[PDB]
Design a protein around this nucleic acid. Sequence first.
RNA 1: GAGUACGGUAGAGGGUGGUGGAAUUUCCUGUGUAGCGGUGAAAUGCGUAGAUAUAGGAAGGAACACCAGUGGCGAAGGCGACCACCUGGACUGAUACUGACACUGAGGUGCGAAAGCGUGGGGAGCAAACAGGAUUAGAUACCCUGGUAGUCCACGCCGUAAACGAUGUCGACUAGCCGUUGGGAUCGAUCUUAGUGGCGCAGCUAACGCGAUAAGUCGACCGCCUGGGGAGUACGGC
Lengths: 106, 62, 62, 88, 129
Amino acid sequence: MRHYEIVFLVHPDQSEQVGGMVERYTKAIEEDGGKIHRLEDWGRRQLAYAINNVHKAHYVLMNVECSAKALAELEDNFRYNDAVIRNLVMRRDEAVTEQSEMLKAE
Amino acid sequence: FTAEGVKEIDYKDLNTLKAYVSETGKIVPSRITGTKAKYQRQLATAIKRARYLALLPYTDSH
Amino acid sequence: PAVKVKENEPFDVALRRFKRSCEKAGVLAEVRSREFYEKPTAERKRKAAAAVKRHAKKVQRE
Amino acid sequence: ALSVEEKAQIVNEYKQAEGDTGSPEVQVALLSANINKLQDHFKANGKDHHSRRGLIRMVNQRRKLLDYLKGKDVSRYTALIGRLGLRR
Amino acid sequence: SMQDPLADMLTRIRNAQMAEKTVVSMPSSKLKAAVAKVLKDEGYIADFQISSEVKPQLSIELKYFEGKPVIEEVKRISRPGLRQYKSVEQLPKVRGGLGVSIVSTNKGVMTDRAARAAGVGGEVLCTVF
RNA sequence: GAGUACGGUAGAGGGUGGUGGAAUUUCCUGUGUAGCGGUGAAAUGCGUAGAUAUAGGAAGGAACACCAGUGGCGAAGGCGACCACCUGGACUGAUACUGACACUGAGGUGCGAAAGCGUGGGGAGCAAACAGGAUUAGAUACCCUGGUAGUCCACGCCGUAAACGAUGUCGACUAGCCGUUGGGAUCGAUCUUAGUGGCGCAGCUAACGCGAUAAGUCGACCGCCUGGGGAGUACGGC
Ligand SMILES: [Mg+2]
Ligand SMILES: [Mg+2]
Ligand SMILES: [Mg+2]
Ligand SMILES: [Mg+2]
Ligand SMILES: [Mg+2]
Ligand SMILES: [Mg+2]
Ligand SMILES: [Mg+2]
Ligand SMILES: [Mg+2]
Ligand SMILES: [Mg+2]
Ligand SMILES: [Mg+2]
Ligand SMILES: [Mg+2]
Ligand SMILES: [Mg+2]
Ligand SMILES: [Mg+2]
Ligand SMILES: [Mg+2]
Ligand SMILES: [Mg+2]
Ligand SMILES: [Mg+2]
Ligand SMILES: [Mg+2]
Ligand SMILES: [Mg+2]
């Protein structure tokens, strides 16, 4: 109904609650009435430039099919979270499942 | 672009995105690579999105 | 705008490499373009003149 | 402004010969519904003139269609104007 | 917005003889057919054909004689903005009678000479020389 | 002819919020010293009260390089950071549907660059007025150092521009060649559409030139002109 590909990256110092943080978020999509069709993780990556005097962050992408209220609450949680550091969404009209790339190399 | 690999390209295959960025982080004009107008148009915004995510740099100096 | 030194070549090849890199970057053009404000009318006039010159060159190529 | 489902509902409840959409009544109903659904959008966005141009275009088109229908058949005009319930 | 189709017939014929073509195709009508018939009767065109199937099309074959078109000048007199009507004695004589002027009388669409012979005036439609 | 229903594309079309990096300026702190800035040449100005360069930090405002194109969108004016939400129109494919429901349009109704006006905010760069230094016979200018309104936002007003293609809107016909934007169909080629450019045959034009995006051949309706000044001025109305 309203798909959203959201890529969220988080502070490296707190790159251990991210394993549980998604369950603090995915928790919503079911009682809203939506389904996640993809979730990946390639966190602890190198930054291109300094974002509040850091150079590394833990990345995570996921797809969501939720209502407006779920979007509002998740973005408000991002806004008032101390880690947050970055957020962005790519609302699309389809579904994608097959990861993003992982590493095609050995 | 047209034969097999991705009719529409997202900002995902950085192996393709980095092929279209100059050594100083600028975007290569279409007349140099010889690509098409539609693909250049979507490729520019793909690079901008990837660049905001701090995957790619604004400037090579920074 | 930046080049490394390595493997003790004479200090002229690296100089020409730096010159070539700087002129690929087009730094001089951009820094000249910021010396004074160009009102938009002059900008469109210059672009139109460049376009007509380019098309005349391409037509005269045959 | 309208989507597929409610457009189908309107053409269903305003059809004339089981499979027509060009009849005047369907067009007037669709235009009136779209105008009504756009009024609340224009309530909040006062400085959007470019869309208000299209709104006025729909208003004029509906007026033309109503004039033609009143020219053709009076009774159908009265029935339609009563069902949509608008001044003229 | 196609306010007048007979002027469109005349203009199509004129522009086609300027371009050195042989056949002209257009939508047909019971007035265009009469005009084409009188033109053929006067010898200004070779033939005219009308198709079937609710959208009939008039196809006119043009003459050339020498290296110049046979129809030298053609012009519509009574446009939908004037509606000129003439009597018997006021019927125009184009080029001293060498050409013809089409008149729609109560007896049908015909030429000025026929109207003078029958003693009937009418609605002047176009002039050809 | 005109319009409706159904899929799919492209777009700086409009509105409301949020978020980015670079760069300028100002303030604070560190080593370090005597010059910086500017010009045709200078000077005003800033300077050991530690500048510029340089390192670290802080606040604040505005514009969105590279893509970028005879490129796109919009009735015109005009519209380039990214993201979400609300929304208008155009283009494209087949079928069904309505069955002339159309064109133009005196009055009227709106939208309408920039400058300007009112109330309340904000204020980094720039910069009418203005101050000083030059140049000059003079220089109420061009040049240099500063600098206020304004340029920015909300609401309201103002109705103007070389508001230009100096070319009113709508419809139909008339050789061709080379590009290009975004869609289809056939077997890279061909065919066909809606735009957007460069040449060019007839034809037109006083000439320049226009030439399927006519200024050619024709229709429908509207606006306007009648020697140069006085003058788009006076008087009256709004
Ligand atoms: Mg300093
Ligand atoms: Mg009109
Ligand atoms: Mg008027
Ligand atoms: Mg008006
Ligand atoms: Mg203004
Ligand atoms: Mg003001
Ligand atoms: Mg004020
Ligand atoms: Mg000055
Ligand atoms: Mg004042
Ligand atoms: Mg005027
Ligand atoms: Mg303009
Ligand atoms: Mg004028
Ligand atoms: Mg035309
Ligand atoms: Mg030409
Ligand atoms: Mg003329
Ligand atoms: Mg006079
Ligand atoms: Mg006056
Ligand atoms: Mg007056």
